[PDB]
């Protein structure tokens, strides 16, 4: 009844399985990344590091049976995704809704993850935006109000306001955001000094129009170019001030593959290493 951890999954063919990731008991959210191809005349495509999309169906259900929420992340660190036209936004919204956020209907749906129904969509938009991402969020949010309830989340970089997602975050549409306090020395843990990190956190927690702000950290030094902060340091230096915010959601970890190696979340939670 204390720390919620969101974790990205799908980043390595050889990673701990989705079902085993959920079985750790360490995570409140598992975020499958990524639908990294869409927009500009492209057909939608997943890059989930060679994992079988249809094979995820029972694993997603297992996760959900363990009261882990499972999201699909759109965009990702890189990839041929864009959302320049209003039609692109409509198309992506409908595709996501029909294939991932509703039970199957008819026979024409591609159902990448089979008959699984996901708990929401994560906006990990790292280039291009703000584009038509506001319209995409508007249409998905409309669906949130007209059928199955699901979450909308975002993964901005740590400079407030985010260049790709800042305007969409300002609409208050996201249930939660996890800020990437890494690959960005100006707003991350750096030179063994947390001042810039804590200044950035203060701003995000004050200004981000969302009920829950999570702090995103790398799970291992190799998981990001910069910004790794050891788990004892996060507990000691970040948590007392972060917990003073009514918006404190917990932490997000990049990513399950590396967390399996490092046992970062085990250390955060005080579970045996």
Distance, CA of 60 to CA of 55 (rounded, Å)? 9
What are the φ/ψ torsions at residue 154 (nearest 5 degrees)? -140, 155
| 126 annotated active-site | yes
Catalytic residue among 15, 126, 149, 203: 126
Beta strands 45-46 and 29-37, pairing class = antiparallel
251: left (phi over 0), alpha (psi -120 to 50) or beta: beta
The angstrom resolution of this structure is: 1.3
Distance, CA of 267 to CA of 95 (rounded, Å)? 39
DSSP 186: G
Distance, CA of 47 to CA of 76 (rounded, Å)? 9
Half-sphere exposure in the Cβ direction for 121 (13 Å, CA)? 28
Give the residue from 185, 238, 186, 192 showing the smallest Cα distance to 214.
238
Who contacts 60 (Cβ-Cβ below 8 Å, separation ≥6)?
18, 70, 113, 116, 118
Nearest 10 degrees: CA dihedral of 67, 72, 76, 82? Answer: -160
Distance, CA of 229 to CA of 221 (rounded, Å)? 8
Which method, experimentally, gave rise to this model?
A: X-ray
Strand partners, 251: 5, 215
- The full set of domain ranges for the chain reads 1-273
- Within the chain, strands assigned E span 5-9, 29-37, 45-46, 69-76, 120-125, 151-154, 176-180, 212-218, 248-254
Distance, CA of 198 to CA of 182 (rounded, Å)? 13
Q: After which residues is the chain broken (C to N over 2.5 A)?
A: none
Taken in order 247, 145, 48, 14, the sign of the CA dihedral is: positive
Q: Would you tell me which CATH number, out of the four given (3.30.70.1520, 3.20.20.80, 3.30.750.24, 3.30.505.50), belongs to the domain 1-273?
A: 3.20.20.80
């Amino acid at each position: 009844g204390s720390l919620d951890i969101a974790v990205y999954w799908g980043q390595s063919f050889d990673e701990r399985s989705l079902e085993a990731t959920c079985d750790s008991g360490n995570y409140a959210y598992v975020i499958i990344g990524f639908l990294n191809t869409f927009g500009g005349g492209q057909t939608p495509a997943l890059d989930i590091s060679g994992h079988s999309p249809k094979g995820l169906e029972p694993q997603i259900k297992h996760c959900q049976s363990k009261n882990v929420k499972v999201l699909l992340s759109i965009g990702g660190p890189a990839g041929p995704y864009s959302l320049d036209s209003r039609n692109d936004a409509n198309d992506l919204a409908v595709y996501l809704h029909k294939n991932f956020l509703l039970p199957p209907a008819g026979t024409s749906e591609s159902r990448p993850f089979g008959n699984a129904v996901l708990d929401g969509i994560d906006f990990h938009i790292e280039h291009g935006g703000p584009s038509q991402y506001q319209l995409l969020a508007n249409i998905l949010s409309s669906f949130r109000l007209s059928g199955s309830e699901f979450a909308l989340t975002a993964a901005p970089q740590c400079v407030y306001p985010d260049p790709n997602l800042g305007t969409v975050i300002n609409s208050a549409t996201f249930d939660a955001i996890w800020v990437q306090f890494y690959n960005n020395p100006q707003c991350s843990y750096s030179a063994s000094n947390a001042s810039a990190l804590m200044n950035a956190w203060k701003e995000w927690s004050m200004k981000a129009r969302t009920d829950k702000v999570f702090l995103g950290f790398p799970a291992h030094p190799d998981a990001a170019g910069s910004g790794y902060m050891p788990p004892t340091k996060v507990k000691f230096s970040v948590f007392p001030n972060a917990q003073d915010s009514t918006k404190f959601g917990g932490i997000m970890l990049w990513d399950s593959y590396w967390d399996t190696v490092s046992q970062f979340s085990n250390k955060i939670l005080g579970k045996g290493v």
